[PDB]
Ligand binder design. Structure first.
Ligand code: CLA
Ligand code: CLA
Ligand code: CLA
Ligand code: CLA
Ligand code: CLA
Ligand code: CLA
Ligand code: CLA
Ligand SMILES: CC1=C(/C=C/C(C)=C/C=C/C(C)=C\C=C\C=C(C)\C=C\C=C(C)\C=C\C2=C(C)C[C@@H](O)CC2(C)C)C(C)(C)C[C@H](O)C1
Ligand SMILES: CC1=C(/C=C/C(C)=C/C=C/C(C)=C/C=C/C=C(C)/C=C/C=C(C)/C=C/C2=C(C)CCCC2(C)C)C(C)(C)CCC1
Ligand SMILES: CC1=C(/C=C/C(C)=C/C=C/C(C)=C/C=C/C=C(C)/C=C/C=C(C)/C=C/C2=C(C)CCCC2(C)C)C(C)(C)CCC1
Ligand SMILES: CC1=C(C/C=C(\C)CCC[C@H](C)CCC[C@H](C)CCCC(C)C)C(=O)c2ccccc2C1=O
Ligand code: SF4
Ligand code: SF4
Lengths: 75, 75, 158, 28, 32, 75, 38, 80, 117, 730
């Protein structure tokens, strides 16, 4: 329904009435909060871990040559 | 189908790509997921239509088998 | 006829030949003469020449592609008529020997068993006897052995 | 240009069709 | 148009009021 | 089932050994495209032997066998 | 004799005959490639 | 309700009656066949029209025939 | 209540575990048993189970009307319907075969069906 | 008759939601209604026909009134090549400001018309909004009149007798001479008096038409027989349409080809066509014996047509009675002929544009071709459906013994088996050749394609005078007796048109056109196979030898005898609809791409890309989707937003249909049982009671509901694409 609402509002020239990052925001705050905890884990709740389990959660962009291996996946 | 489409588009839009000498990330589909993936029209146009360009232009190239299998699989 | 011309005299056809060699040579340029990549791409280049030379005698559209005439004109017999006759000879053979074998199986004690487990000697006998199927079929037609009678065939109520 | 009167004349004749339509519908 | 007010009266009528009346009428008709 | 899986795995290793650019790929992992299927020249299907690098022409593989074999220490 | 009966079963004879057929057509196109007419 | 009819080619095999999950059918005495009995459909008010009876009938064509008719609570198989 | 119900009574020597036609395991009493079911088919499905698995033959199925009327349904005559029994009058017989049924054209704008001889 | 539906006690007694659905779905199957008699059936149909006609005149009225009130007809007349005609105003309070601006056409928020009404109305002489409006009022009166007639003819004294309704000879005389003939004569009157004057900038209307003679010579030539006078001084090739500049005086001509400005048929050709047609129909409608002791008996004609060999048995003996006594036979023939007419309208109107400047309105051309081919497709499926219904409900074998109709059933297996053969042949070889082409093109060798020249169709173009292919036959031969005979009449104008590559008159055809024509042949044969098999097996098969006893539509005969899903003749209708949609798809795709390529001036694109199926997917569907799917996007929206939204809506509706077509009833009935359980056990909610027990849709209902979603989605998807792709491109 949120997609159909959005298709309808965008088609009617009503971008400010959409579910989007720039209109009516639906932030996955629990997923965002869990990303933060996993980013803060190394040296804290995983004291002997030097770096995050995954760069998907946060911290650095890993490149091999010029190409991105992994980086934070913002929700 | 929706899981692997979510994966393909999110990774191309927001993760995979090149990092220049300056250190600016250019993603494969240049961050279009956030504003396009909130409508079905955005999925149809910015995902299926836009990304099908490679498979339908594959004839006379080494990827032509994918073009043939794309049509064969539709059949 | 301006729509169709002999491919030999067709500029679009010559252009297509040149384009296909150029594409193969643009690929070949990334390989070092004696390499398998070069030799494989050179083989394809040689066959491009042989193909376009072979299709030269065909009629070509403005697209520069060979167009086949199938109207019965004997000047184009090689395009359709001769392949057509060969097709019908081969498939008439397949159908005829299939019918021959099927008729054999219905004389046996377990006809259905001979459809899923072939009597290979009998299959070979009928398969090798297909080469004069048009005469064989004519002889069965003349003798009233080709067709079942309307009386003897099961039908649903009208 | 079609005047207000012309649009309202159309509406009364469409009303008449409405009346006659209901009469037919009710009988069928 | 000349009578540019009319769509403001007739579109709600044909679009909201009359369909509700028709649904209400048909509901009673098919449930009695 | 295990017998069949062993034939399939064996196949993947043999295609790696005999019809692949794996050895060349080890020396240029970012530049060379992994390839372990070569098609025969017939009815023009040799177009599918792509310019993958490492001194062969073949189909680019996406199974990740080269990355597996490199992790396993196969040289 | 039982193995020969098996090798006479529909799917085996179909597989072998169509293999043979495919082989002939493939080999004709290997030696006589790009035959668009007779 | 559904209509269930028994035609004269019934061989009194009882298979339709055994198959009926609604007890619509029963076997009745009859001199017309060697079995000495014919299918009967006395309780078609209970017939759901499942055609398990027709599936079970060995005669060619069917000796028992189910004509699906006007739906009822019973025939629609409703437990509400 | 508002709709027709079905009472199924039977007797058992043992306390057999059986499957409810509404799903799940039940234990029948070593003696008289009474189940209320929404559908005749549920009662008969249970009756088939009782007969085949537990060799219980004395089951009786009733229709309870919301008025309060109790109609004995099964086995109607006391004998199972697939056993031929004297006193049963044939219902639904058509003479000859289905092949002798008339055309719908012949029966159009009439009460008659194609099988009405 | 004390609960909906009043016409079916069997449905009215149903305690479930099925009662309502089946009430709606069977409301017009008058034959099956409680206590229906033949006399009451006919009388009900006759009165319903008046309702339907009145609806056509109200709809037409709406179109005239909306264009008069909200359109830009007057502004469009002034500049027909640049100005976009308006359908009607938008009043939608869900519109944002950006959408109001996007749909602003001048000073009004409006839809553009793609119906070709402005082109048609302009061609027939309408020049201002008051004339359109007068039309609207005039047609509201016609609607009201037909509603009065409809009402009158179900009043006891005005109910016509069954014998009246079966007076074939009279109805044919009147319909031929009167309905076709006199209508065409009267229409000729309009073209000569109003449309042709309007074309030459001379205003003739109700105000002056008594005084203003449509020809200088008057009716003196017509009674003296000096008819050549009416063809003298045609409109010059420099004529500016709607003006006297280069205007002639002729009212009846045989110029052939097109008005060079309007790229449409000469109005004086269309006047003379309709005069010729009017006379042919007036003469044709004096064939049949009525009340004056001359003419033919239709039975006497039919009964006489028995070949003496006995090869058609009793020939047409009994056919008269069979046809006269079956409304379904009548509806079948009527739908069959009307379908063919609708297809011919589609083919002839694109090729020989009747309406001024409509050749330049590309969206309208595409819209009209597609609209009419889908109507033609629906009509031919319906024709065969009523053919099947006829065989079950009305066909009496005894009354058709050994006649042509009975003989069809006698060799139904021969007919079905041969349709199966031709369908298989076309399917194997058409798909085969396309796939051959796709593979060799995919491997970079388009010169290996099998590109068969449509030489028979090219030869036919040459017989009508197309010089392009190098054939010198009949009208393309200067010395042919065909050529010389027509040289002084239509041939110069016709040859100019047919040898012009810019118009749609005998489009140049090549291998692309060969392959898709075999695709079209495949679709016609397979759709026909399904519908004919449906009709000839409607009465019974080996699987169900008593099928006629179960009627046209029933779910199945259960899982016995191997299983019998979709065995009814109705199920053949259901299956044929998919093939009809598929086939009209191929036809309309072909028409549209061929025209997009022509209109772009890139005929080479179609010619090269049409010979393999990736060409269609890439260069037709993918390429032309771009304007449509950008109707709205993150950056904003434009006037194509509505087609973009409709496009997605239609894909949704199509896909929703799959649910009904793939998932069958038992799944749903079990699920509904749990929902009924939940409702009754939920506090507060369980105070509210359904009156109708909720049940899953019936087996046949779901086929119909699934097919409707499929069909609606199919049509709306293509409508949105064909309009937005063409509108977006030009
Ligand atoms: C000896 C085998 C044989 C012969 C002589 C025929 C002959 C015919 N078939 Mg039949 N058919 C066959 C096998 C055969 N068929 C098989 C195995 C199938 C299942 C796929 C069919 C399915 C079929 C359909 C659906 C239709 C026909 C039709 C026809 C008729 C028209 C021609 C046609 O369409 O053929 C072409 C037939 C096909 C493309 C079907 C496949 C043919 C197979 C592959 C050939 C098998 C050969 C066999 C294995 C040889 C073994 C012999 C050996 C042991 C000695 C013609 C009477 C049509 C008809 O009724 O016309 C009036 C029609 O609509 N056939
Ligand atoms: C022709 C058909 C039609 C019409 C004229 C409308 C009109 C409207 N709809 Mg839409 N809508 C429709 C069909 C229609 N709808 C259908 C079929 C759907 C299902 C897809 C929707 C789904 C939909 C949604 C989800 C929403 C709308 C909304 C609106 C309002 C937006 C304008 C605004 O900013 O008002 C703002 C509100 C007002 C100015 C207050 C007026 C509200 C009514 C008129 C109160 C009247 C009270 C009165 C005393 C008693 C009469 C009640 C009733 C019988 C009419 C407008 C009233 C929006 C809305 O605001 O609705 C409340 C909204 O959120 N519509
Ligand atoms: C199944 C039917 C079939 C038939 C009739 C042929 C026929 C032939 N093969 Mg082929 N061949 C086949 C299958 C077949 N082959 C298969 C499945 C393979 C893969 C194992 C090969 C691999 C192969 C090789 C490597 C060679 C042949 C060669 C030949 C030719 C030898 C003279 C002859 C034309 C020989 C030839 O003359 O080509 C140079 C040759 O060297 N074949
Ligand atoms: C359905 C119809 C159809 C038809 C009529 C054709 C026809 C053809 N194809 Mg195509 N093709 C098709 C479907 C079809 N194909 C499909 C579905 C595909 C995808 C699998 C292809 C993919 C394909 C490729 C990739 C190629 C062809 C080629 C050919 C040509 C082969 C000539 C040959 O084998 O040597 C001659 C063979 C004979 C004379 C048979 C003789 C049989 C026996 C031994 C004779 C015994 C004596 C009596 C011929 C023009 C080739 C070509 O050269 O194109 C120009 C080619 O390279 N086809
Ligand atoms: C198939 C025959 C046919 C059709 C479809 C048309 C259609 C049209 N005519 Mg044409 N016309 C026709 C025959 C036809 N005419 C004939 C035979 C003549 C005499 C030579 C005319 C003379 C004519 C003139 C002078 C004018 C038209 C106009 C028109 C347009 C508006 C008509 C209207 O408002 O009536 C609405 C429809 C009806 C009233 C239908 C019911 C028919 C009734 C029952 C019969 C009466 C006929 C007529 C309405 C009144 C007669 C007047 C009297 C003095 C004789 C419309 C495009 C007008 C226009 O604006 O041109 C662009 C206009 O001024 N027509
Ligand atoms: C002059 C044309 C004509 C006439 C007079 C008839 C008359 C009849 N037809 Mg025939 N038929 C026709 C054309 C015609 N048909 C055509 C063109 C087809 C092919 C489609 C058929 C196919 C056909 C079949 C398969 C059947 C009939 C049946 C019948 C009988 C009535 C069934 C009924 O009650 O309908 C009631 C109809 C409905 C309830 C359907 C409602 C409307 C549909 C679903 C469209 C919905 C569109 C949707 C709202 C749009 C969505 C918009 C979107 C933006 C959301 C009646 C004798 C039936 C019969 O019983 O005969 C034995 C029967 O089974 N007809
Ligand atoms: C792409 C979709 C599609 C395709 C290809 C088919 C194909 C066919 N339909 Mg079907 N149909 C479809 C959708 C489709 N249908 C849909 C959505 C419906 C609605 C339910 C129907 C309903 C329908 C009905 C009611 C009927 C058909 C019939 C047919 C046959 C028509 C004649 C023909 O073309 O023969 C040529 C055959 C084909 C084109 C099929 C493909 C053959 C392939 C290419 C050969 C593959 C061989 C190759 C070596 C690969 C092997 C694979 C390996 C794993 C073994 C054909 C088999 C009719 C029929 O059977 O007529 C005789 C018929 O009466 N169809
Ligand atoms: C024998 C035997 C079989 C028996 C099959 C038997 C009964 C077949 C029955 C046929 C029927 C009765 C009528 C056949 C009608 C033949 C048609 C009407 C062909 C007209 C020719 C066209 C019109 C070509 C025109 C043209 C040509 C001239 C030249 C082209 O270039 C142009 C075109 C335009 C194509 C089997 C099935 C058992 C298999 C077995 O294997 C062998
Ligand atoms: C007077 C006036 C007014 C008012 C008006 C109005 C408001 C109107 C309305 C109107 C309307 C509101 C109309 C209506 C219409 C309707 C119609 C016209 C319908 C139709 C129908 C038909 C035609 C058909 C149908 C049918 C069906 C479908 C079913 C059954 C059968 C039948 C066929 C019947 C005002 C205020 C301005 C003021 C001034 C004065
Ligand atoms: C099932 C059935 C049915 C139905 C049917 C149908 C549906 C059909 C259809 C059909 C069709 C749909 C048909 C069609 C056809 C057509 C035709 C037959 C045509 C022809 C034509 C011609 C002959 C031509 C000629 C020409 C040319 C080509 C050119 C020039 C000119 C001319 C004219 C010379 C019925 C009801 C009956 C009844 C019962 C059964
Ligand atoms: C989804 C689906 C359902 C479930 C859908 C059902 C039961 C329809 C659901 C009701 C719809 C949503 C309409 C609701 C109507 C409102 C209550 C308004 C009043 C209706 C008037 C007719 C009175 C089936 O029952 C079914 C049966 C057989 C084959 C396929 C399917 C199938 O695919
Ligand atoms: S259709 Fe079902 S319920 Fe009816 S008699 Fe047959 S088996 Fe019994
Ligand atoms: S199954 Fe058929 S034959 Fe047997 S008793 Fe029942 S109706 Fe008679």
């Amino acid at each position: 329904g949120l997609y159909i609402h959005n298709d309808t509002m965008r088609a009617l020239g009503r971008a400010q009435d959409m579910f989007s990052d720039t209109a009516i925001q639906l932030q996955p705050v629990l997923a965002q909060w869990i990303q933060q905890i996993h980013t803060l884990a190394p040296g804290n709740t995983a004291v002997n871990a030097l770096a995050t389990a995954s760069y998907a959660f946060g911290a650095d962009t890993v490149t091999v040559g010029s190409k991105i291996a992994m980086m934070p996946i913002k929700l | 189908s929706v899981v692997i489409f979510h994966f393909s588009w999110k990774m191309q839009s927001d993760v995979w790509g090149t990092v220049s000498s300056n250190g600016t990330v250019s993603h494969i589909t240049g961050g279009n997921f956030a504003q396009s993936a909130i409508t079905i029209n955005g999925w149809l146009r910015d995902f299926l239509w836009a990304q099908a360009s490679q498979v339908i232009q594959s004839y006379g190239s080494s990827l032509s088998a994918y073009g043939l299998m794309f049509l064969g699989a539709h059949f | 006829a301006d729509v169709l011309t002999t491919c030999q005299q067709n500029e679009a056809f010559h252009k297509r030949e040149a384009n296909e060699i150029r594409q193969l040579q643009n690929r070949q340029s990334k390989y070092d003469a004696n390499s398998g990549g070069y030799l494989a791409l050179q083989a394809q280049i040689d066959q491009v020449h042989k193909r376009f030379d072979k299709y030269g005698e065909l009629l070509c559209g403005q697209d520069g592609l060979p167009h086949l005439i199938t109207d019965g004109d004997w000047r184009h017999a090689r395009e359709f008529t001769i392949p057509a006759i060969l097709f019908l000879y081969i498939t008439g053979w397949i159908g005829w020997v299939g019918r021959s074998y099927l008729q054999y199986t219905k004389q046996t004690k377990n006809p259905t068993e001979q459809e899923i487990i072939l009597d290979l000697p009998m299959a070979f006998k009928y398969m090798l006897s297909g080469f004069l199927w048009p005469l064989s079929a004519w002889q069965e037609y003349r003798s009233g052995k080709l067709l079942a009678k309307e009386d003897e065939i099961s039908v649903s109520p009208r | 240009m079609i005047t207000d009167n012309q649009v309202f004349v159309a509406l009364i004749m469409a009303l008449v069709c409405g009346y006659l339509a209901v009469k037919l519908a009710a009988q069928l | 148009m000349s009578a540019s007010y009319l769509p403001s009266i007739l579109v709600p009528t044909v679009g909201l009021i009359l369909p509700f009346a028709t649904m209400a009428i048909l509901f009673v008709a098919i449930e009695k | 089932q295990l017998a069949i899986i062993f034939i399939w795995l064996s196949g993947m290793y043999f295609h790696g050994a005999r019809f692949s650019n794996y050895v060349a790929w080890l020396s240029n992992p970012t530049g060379i495209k992994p390839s372990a299927q070569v098609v025969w020249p017939i009815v023009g299907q040799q177009i599918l032997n792509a310019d993958v690098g490492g001194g062969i022409q073949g189909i680019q593989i996406t199974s990740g066998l080269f990355q597996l074999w490199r992790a396993s220490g196969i040289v | 004799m039982n193995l020969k009966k098996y090798l006479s079963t529909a799917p085996v004879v179909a597989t072998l005959w169509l293999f043979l057929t495919a082989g002939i057509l493939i080999e004709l196109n290997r030696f006589y490639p790009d035959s668009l007419f007779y | 309700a559904h209509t269930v009819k028994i035609y004269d080619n019934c061989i009194g095999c009882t298979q339709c009656v055994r198959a009926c999950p609604l007890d619509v059918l029963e076997m009745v005495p009859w001199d017309g066949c060697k079995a000495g009995q014919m299918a009967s459909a006395p309780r078609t008010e209970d017939c759901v029209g499942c055609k398990r009876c027709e599936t079970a009938c060995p005669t060619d064509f069917l000796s028992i025939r189910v004509y699906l008719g006007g739906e009822t609570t019973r025939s629609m198989g409703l437990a509400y | 209540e508002t709709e027709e119900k079905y009472a199924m009574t039977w007797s058992s020597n043992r306390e057999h575990v059986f499957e409810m036609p509404t799903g799940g395991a039940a234990t029948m009493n070593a003696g008289d048993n009474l189940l209320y079911l929404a559908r005749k088919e549920q009662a008969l499905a249970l009756a088939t189970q009782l007969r085949t698995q537990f060799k219980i033959q004395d089951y009786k199925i009733y229709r309870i009307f919301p008025s309060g009327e109790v109609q004995y349904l099964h086995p109607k005559d006391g004998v199972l319907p697939y056993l031929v029994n004297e006193g049963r009058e044939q219902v639904g017989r058509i003479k000859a075969t289905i092949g002798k049924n008339v055309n719908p054209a012949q029966v159009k704008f009439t009460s008659k069906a194609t099988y009405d001889r | 008759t004390t609960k909906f539906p009043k016409f079916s006690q069997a449905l009215a007694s149903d305690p479930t939601t099925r009662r309502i659905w089946y009430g709606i779905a069977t409301a017009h199957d008058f034959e099956t209604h409680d206590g229906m008699t033949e006399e009451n059936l006919y009388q009900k149909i006759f009165a319903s026909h008046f309702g339907h006609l009145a609806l056509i005149f109200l709809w037409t009225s709406g179109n005239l009134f909306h264009v008069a009130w909200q359109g830009n007809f007057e502004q469009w007349i002034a500049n027909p090549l640049k100005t976009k005609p308006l359908a009607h105003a938008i009043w939608d309070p869900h519109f944002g400001q950006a959408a109001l601006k996007a749909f602003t056409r001048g000073e009004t928020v409006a839809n553009i018309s793609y119906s070709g009404l402005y082109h048609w109305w302009y061609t027939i002489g309408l020049r201002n909004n008051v004339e359109l409006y007068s039309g609207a009022l005039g047609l509201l009166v016609l609607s009201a009149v037909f509603l009065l007639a409809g009402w009158l003819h179900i009043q006891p004294k005005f109910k016509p007798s069954l014998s009246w309704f079966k007076n074939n000879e009279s109805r044919l005389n009147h319909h031929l001479a009167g309905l076709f003939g006199v209508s065409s004569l009267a229409w000729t009157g309009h073209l000569v008096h109003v449309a042709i004057p309007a074309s030459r900038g001379q205003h003739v209307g109700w105000d002056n038409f008594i005084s203003v003679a449509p020809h200088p010579a008057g009716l003196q030539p017509f009674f003296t027989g000096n008819w050549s006078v009416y063809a003298q001084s045609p409109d010059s090739m420099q004529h500016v349409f709607g003006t006297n500049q280069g205007a002639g005086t002729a009212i009846l001509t045989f110029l052939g080809g097109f008005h060079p400005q309007t790229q449409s048929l000469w109005l004086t050709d269309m006047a003379h066509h309709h005069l010729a047609i009017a006379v042919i129909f007036i003469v044709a409608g004096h064939m049949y014996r009525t009340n004056f002791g001359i003419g033919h008996n239709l039975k006497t004609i039919l009964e006489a047509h028995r070949p003496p060999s006995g090869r058609l048995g009793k020939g047409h003996i009994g056919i008269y009675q069979t046809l006269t006594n079956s409304l379904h036979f009548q509806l079948g023939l009527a739908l069959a002929c009307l379908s063919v007419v609708t297809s011919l309208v589609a083919q002839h109107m694109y090729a020989m544009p009747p309406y001024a400047y409509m050749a330049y309105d590309y969206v309208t051309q595409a819209a009209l071709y597609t609209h009419h081919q889908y109507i033609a497709g629906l009509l031919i499926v319906g024709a065969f459906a009523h053919g099947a219904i006829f065989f079950i409900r009305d066909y009496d074998p005894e009354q058709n013994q050994d006649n042509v109709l009975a003989r069809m059933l006698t060799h139904k297996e021969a007919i079905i088996s041969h349709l199966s053969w031709v369908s298989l042949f076309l399917g194997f070889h058409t798909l085969g050749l396309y796939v051959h082409n796709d593979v060799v093109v995919a491997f970079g060798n388009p010169e290996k394609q099998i590109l068969i020249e449509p030489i028979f169709a090219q030869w036919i173009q040459a017989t009508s005078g197309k010089a392009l292919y190098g054939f010198h036959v009949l009208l393309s031969s200067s010395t042919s007796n065909a050529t010389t005979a027509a040289q002084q009449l239509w041939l110069p104008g016709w040859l100019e048109a047919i040898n012009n590559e810019s118009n749609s008159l005998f489009l140049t055809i090549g291998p692309g056109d060969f392959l898709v024509h075999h695709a079209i042949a495949l679709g016609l044969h397979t759709t026909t196979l399904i519908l004919v098999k449906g009709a000839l097996d409607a009465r019974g098969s080996k699987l169900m030898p008593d099928k006629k006893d179960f009627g046209y539509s029933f779910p199945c005969d259960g899982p016995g005898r191997g299983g019998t899903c979709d065995i009814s003749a109705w199920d053949a209708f259901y299956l044929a609809m998919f093939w009809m949609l598929n086939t009209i798809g191929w036809i309309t795709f072909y028409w549209h791409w061929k025209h997009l390529s022509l209109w772009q001036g890139n005929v080479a694109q179609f010619n090269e890309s049409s010979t393999y199926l990736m060409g269609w997917l890439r260069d037709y569907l993918w390429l032309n989707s771009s304007p449509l799917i950008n109707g709205y996007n993150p950056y904003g929206m434009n006037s194509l937003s509505v087609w973009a939204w409709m496009f997605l809506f239609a894909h949704l509706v199509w896909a929703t249909g799959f649910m009904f077509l793939i998932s069958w009833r038992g799944y749903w009935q079990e699920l509904i049982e749990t929902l009924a359980w939940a409702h009754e056990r939920t506090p507060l909610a369980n105070l509210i009671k359904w009156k109708d027990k909720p049940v899953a849709l019936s087996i046949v209902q779901a086929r119909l509901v699934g097919l409707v979603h499929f069909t609606v989605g199919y049509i709306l998807t293509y409508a949105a694409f064909v309009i937005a792709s063409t509108a977006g491109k030009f």
